[PDB]
Amino acid sequence: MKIEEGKLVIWINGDKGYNGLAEVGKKFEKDTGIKVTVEHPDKLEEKFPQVAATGDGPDIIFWAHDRFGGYAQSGLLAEITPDKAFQDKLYPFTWDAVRYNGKLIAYPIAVEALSLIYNKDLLPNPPKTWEEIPALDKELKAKGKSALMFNLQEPYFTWPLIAADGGYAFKYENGKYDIKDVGVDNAGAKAGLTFLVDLIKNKHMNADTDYSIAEAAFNKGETAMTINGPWAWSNIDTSKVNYGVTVLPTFKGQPSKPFVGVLSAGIDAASPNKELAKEFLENYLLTDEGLEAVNKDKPLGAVALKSYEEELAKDPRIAATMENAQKGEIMPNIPQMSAFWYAVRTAVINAASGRQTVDEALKDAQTRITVSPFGGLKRLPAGLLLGHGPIRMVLAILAFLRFTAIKPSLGLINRWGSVGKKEAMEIIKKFKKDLAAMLRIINAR
Amino acid sequence: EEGKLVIWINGDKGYNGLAEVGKKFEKDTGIKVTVEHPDKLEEKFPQVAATGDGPDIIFWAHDRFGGYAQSGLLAEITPDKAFQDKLYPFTWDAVRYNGKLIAYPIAVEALSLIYNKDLLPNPPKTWEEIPALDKELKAKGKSALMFNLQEPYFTWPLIAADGGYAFKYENGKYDIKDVGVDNAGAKAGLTFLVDLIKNKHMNADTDYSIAEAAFNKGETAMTINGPWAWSNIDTSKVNYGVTVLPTFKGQPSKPFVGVLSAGIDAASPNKELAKEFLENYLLTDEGLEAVNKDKPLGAVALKSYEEELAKDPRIAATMENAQKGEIMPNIPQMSAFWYAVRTAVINAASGRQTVDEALKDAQTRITVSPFGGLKRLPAGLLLGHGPIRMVLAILAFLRFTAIKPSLGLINRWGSVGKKEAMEIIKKFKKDLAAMLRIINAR
Numbered sequence: 001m002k003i004e005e006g007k008l009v010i011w012i013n014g015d016k017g018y019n020g021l022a023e024v025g026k027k028f029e030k031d032t033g034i035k036v037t038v039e040h041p042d043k044l045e046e047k048f049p050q051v052a053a054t055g056d057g058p059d060i061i062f063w064a065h066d067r068f069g070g071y072a073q074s075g076l077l078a079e080i081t082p083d084k085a086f087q088d089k090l091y092p093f094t095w096d097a098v099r100y101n102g103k104l105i106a107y108p109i110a111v112e113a114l115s116l117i118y119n120k121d122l123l124p125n126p127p128k129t130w131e132e133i134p135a136l137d138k139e140l141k142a143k144g145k146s147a148l149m150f151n152l153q154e155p156y157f158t159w160p161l162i163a164a165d166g167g168y169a170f171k172y173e174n175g176k177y178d179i180k181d182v183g184v185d186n187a188g189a190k191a192g193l194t195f196l197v198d199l200i201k202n203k204h205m206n207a208d209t210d211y212s213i214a215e216a217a218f219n220k221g222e223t224a225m226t227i228n229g230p231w232a233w234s235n236i237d238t239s240k241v242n243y244g245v246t247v248l249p250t251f252k253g254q255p256s257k258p259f260v261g262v263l264s265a266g267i268d269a270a271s272p273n274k275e276l277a278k279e280f281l282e283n284y285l286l287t288d289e290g291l292e293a294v295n296k297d298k299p300l301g302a303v304a305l306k307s308y309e310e311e312l313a314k315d316p317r318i319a320a321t322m323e324n325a326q327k328g329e330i331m332p333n334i335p336q337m338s339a340f341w342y343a344v345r346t347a348v349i350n351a352a353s354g355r356q357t358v359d360e361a362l363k364d365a366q367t368r369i370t371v372s373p374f375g376g377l378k379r380l381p382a383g384l385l386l387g388h389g390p391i392r393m394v395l396a397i398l399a400f401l402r403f404t405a406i407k408p409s410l411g412l413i414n415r416w417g418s419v420g421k422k423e424a425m426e427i428i429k430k431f432k433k434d435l436a437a438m439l440r441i442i443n444a445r
Numbered sequence: 446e447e448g449k450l451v452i453w454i455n456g457d458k459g460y461n462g463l464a465e466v467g468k469k470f471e472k473d474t475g476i477k478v479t480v481e482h483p484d485k486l487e488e489k490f491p492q493v494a495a496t497g498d499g500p501d502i503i504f505w506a507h508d509r510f511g512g513y514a515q516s517g518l519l520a521e522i523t524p525d526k527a528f529q530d531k532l533y534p535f536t537w538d539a540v541r542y543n544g545k546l547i548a549y550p551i552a553v554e555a556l557s558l559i560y561n562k563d564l565l566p567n568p569p570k571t572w573e574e575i576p577a578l579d580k581e582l583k584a585k586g587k588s589a590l591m592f593n594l595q596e597p598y599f600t601w602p603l604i605a606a607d608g609g610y611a612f613k614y615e616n617g618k619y620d621i622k623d624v625g626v627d628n629a630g631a632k633a634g635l636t637f638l639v640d641l642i643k644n645k646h647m648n649a650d651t652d653y654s655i656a657e658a659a660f661n662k663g664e665t666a667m668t669i670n671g672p673w674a675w676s677n678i679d680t681s682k683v684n685y686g687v688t689v690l691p692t693f694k695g696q697p698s699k700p701f702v703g704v705l706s707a708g709i710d711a712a713s714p715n716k717e718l719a720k721e722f723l724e725n726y727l728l729t730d731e732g733l734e735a736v737n738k739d740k741p742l743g744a745v746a747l748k749s750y751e752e753e754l755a756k757d758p759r760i761a762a763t764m765e766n767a768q769k770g771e772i773m774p775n776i777p778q779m780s781a782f783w784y785a786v787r788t789a790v791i792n793a794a795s796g797r798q799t800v801d802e803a804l805k806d807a808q809t810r811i812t813v814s815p816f817g818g819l820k821r822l823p824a825g826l827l828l829g830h831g832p833i834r835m836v837l838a839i840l841a842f843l844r845f846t847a848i849k850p851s852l853g854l855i856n857r858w859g860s861v862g863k864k865e866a867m868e869i870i871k872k873f874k875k876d877l878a879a880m881l882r883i884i885n886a887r
């Protein structure tokens with residue numbers, strides 16, 4: 001939504017406790033008279049880099065830390081410099097997750113990892129291994145039930161199994177990720193995705209199953225197990241299903257390795273409410289009371305705030321969450337992560353639907369990820385400098401030529417003379433908007 | 446501002462007489478007409494065009510307008526058939542570019558040999574006479590010849606005499622690949638000029654102001670200048686004659702002929718005002734007379750008044766030297782030509798370069814000038830290599846067109862110095878604003 005000075009607009013995912021966040025925003029307005037609006041737009045992580053620094057986006061964006069590296073590379077995030085006093089209140093490993101090229105670029109909020117969730121009434125002792133689940137499903141099927149439903153549309157949920165036997169995103173040693181060494185192709189990844197695919201083939205799961213379908217099934221008591229994060233516990237509580245939260249099953253004796261996200265709050269680089277945002281984040285949200293308000297709505301997991309984390313550590317569900325976290329890996333925050341997640345999402349969906357073989361799917365994913373950094377434009381359109389092409393491109397290259405004090409061709413200046421007054425004026429105004437965004441990003445540094 | 450008129454014209458021309466017709470315009474229209482004469486106005490204009498910091502009307506030799514037009518800085522002019530017949534057809538030609546009229550022709554101007562009758566009763570008819578002439582005058586405490594050596598315009602008539610030429614003219618087009626700055630003719634003309642200097646007949650530092658002061662005080666017998674110069678000379682009370690330029694190897698001195706022209710900025714909100722001013726106030730008998738009465742224009746483009754003044758012997762001399770020379774080309778490449786020859790002449794004059802050095806340098810420099818427009822991006826730009834301004838510009842292009850930049854390019858964006866990038870981008874925004882003012886004025 002359109003940002004004004006003297007107000008705060010926040011984006012969070014629709015699965016997070018946005019209503020509880022709205023409540024701490026209410027206390028903020030009570031004290032400051034500054035209105036806080038919380039929104040949960042669809043595809044906000046894709047949306048943000050598109051509207052950032054223009055004024056059409058939020059002042060504050062919430063998301064797992066993995067996407068913030070790409071934002072920062074674009075310069076879309078304000079640098080966070082909290083006082084050492086505040087920085088001490090949060091676990092250091094959580095600040096690590098939001099540090100990019102020597103700069104802190106967001107506030108860590110909570111650590112989230114997937115767990116195995118099970119119906120204690122249907123399944124008193126959940127399976128310790130993935131390999132046991134087919135026999136278990138056959139057993140539950142005879143009673144009109146299902147062994148396991150979790151959404152297969154999002155790579156976040158299937159990745160833990162794919163990584164169990166040796167799959168990895170980017171090779172990590174010391175403090176660096178090797179963008180040339182991707183592990184989506186290897187034997188471990190294939191074995192993990194193959195087991196998943198066989199699950200579907202043998203009718204133990206359906207390839208179409210998404211978040212909504214899996215949640216409803218578990219919450220209605222139709223399935224004995226699901227895989228989900230702390231945010232899901234609220235709805236399960238409401239359905240009164242007697243459930244347990246535990247360690248994910250092993251694959252080939254090895255733990256499922258979930259990617260660990262740190263839910264983090266970023267401040268838009270061009271925001272005129274930067275001081276406002278930092279006050280809200282530091283002094284209202286990242287407190288025992290602010291976190292409890294959000295956690296009350298939808299559980300955060302293990303909060304980054306030492307004070308409240310120790311208080312919530314007692315909960316067995318959170319201990320299970322943290323146990324899975326230790327067995328998994330903190331997500332890298334590098335820009336290539338976007339390419340990784342996109343390529344792997346395609347591979348899992350294609351393999352699961354029998355659309356491609358496992359080997360075909362993963363080879364494609366690996367190639368797509370390995371080559372992504374080498375992308376970008378390499379040549380201008382053949383006749384752009386001659387004045388050939390869409391009017392938008394032509395006015396853009398004329399702008400380029402003027403910026404660099406270089407004389408345009410005759411074919412190009414003819415287009416400039418021939419363009420309609422209304423057409424050129426709308427196209428340019430957009431350019432003005434782009435230039436203004438660029439200046440705001442540089443100025444915020 | 447809207448409802449005001451700002452005009453630029455060279456400072457040695459009749460800007461005061463021009464301001465007079467402007468007060469006339471203000472009397473009948475209520476719109477104030479401001480006249481300014483910035484130094485290097487012909488170089489400054491493309492810098493300030495469409496920004497709001499420049500003039501509504503710019504006066505200059507037709508020479509420079511082909512370049513202005515190519516950058517879209519000029520408004521197309523479309524006078525009636527009635528007004529067009531008022532001016533000589535050959536002057537409308539000089540202000541034709543890409544099948545469009547881009548300025549109003551005012552007057553035709555060419556250089557002439559001006560001489561002191563008291564010091565030199567019969568002026569030299571050849572150039573080769575001048576050295577010995579200088580010796581004769583030096584014994585009387587005088588000088589033979591002083592004229593501006595800092596501007597290629599004043600030297601060119603000598604350089605072009607023995608076969609030096611700007612751009613070849615075949616058919617109805619100028620051969621952009623055929624430049625004659627390095628040939629034997631150009632060599633002979635400049636070498637002589639240089640030997641003239643090393644033999645202390647002239648000084649390489651001599652500029653417009655110095656030469657004018659010397660002639661008008663009667664310290665030098667000759668100078669080389671345009672019709673605009675006659676006004677100050679009249680006032681100095683020096684008895685002078687305006688005659689044909691000297692010869693060189695029996696061949697005539699070939700001055701480049703200029704048509705003083707008035708042009709309107711593409712972004713002017715007062716274009717309608719400007720056109721009425723130029724057509725109905727300036728380019729009349731009364732308007733031109735007012736200007737010519739300040740500083741002589743030469744042979745004006747208005748048929749009527751040119752006929753009334755083709756009686757003055759000074760204009761007769763002007764036109765006489767004009768026939769011997771050539772009308773300047775108005776192509777965009779003319780800008781690179783003048784700059785290249787300016788350096789070659791200044792360099793040779795100071796012994797900084799030998800003549801062959803200076804001309805070969807200018808020649809290849811004029812032949813490889815990119816007025817034909819950009820054909821390729823610089824090597825490695827899209828890979829993120831090059832000067833920061835260019836890299837920032839291409840990143841802007843990419844954002845404008847929603848195209849993904851390379852990683853090298855993205856790396857330059859994060860690596861750029863803040864103050865440097867900010868000044869470049871603020872500049873970009875002003876450039877974009879100028880483009881919009883041009884469109885908004887249509």
Ligand SMILES: OC[C@H]1O[C@H](O[C@H]2[C@H](O)[C@@H](O)[C@@H](O)O[C@@H]2CO)[C@H](O)[C@@H](O)[C@@H]1O
Binds near residue numbers: 157
């Ligand atoms: O899918 C719901 C769940 O996904 C998120 O994980 C993301 C990752 O963070 C994104 O950058 C993108 O790559 O897709 C992944 C899902 O495949 C969050 O970590 C989590 O909070 C959110 O609820």
Ligand SMILES: OC[C@H]1O[C@H](O[C@H]2[C@H](O)[C@@H](O)[C@@H](O)O[C@@H]2CO)[C@H](O)[C@@H](O)[C@@H]1O
Binds near residue numbers: 508671
């Ligand atoms: O000398 C280079 C210069 O020559 C011409 O400039 C003349 C101008 O045309 C005259 O009207 C008068 O102002 O004297 C000037 C030279 O001092 C060209 O018009 C100009 O573009 C070129 O650079």
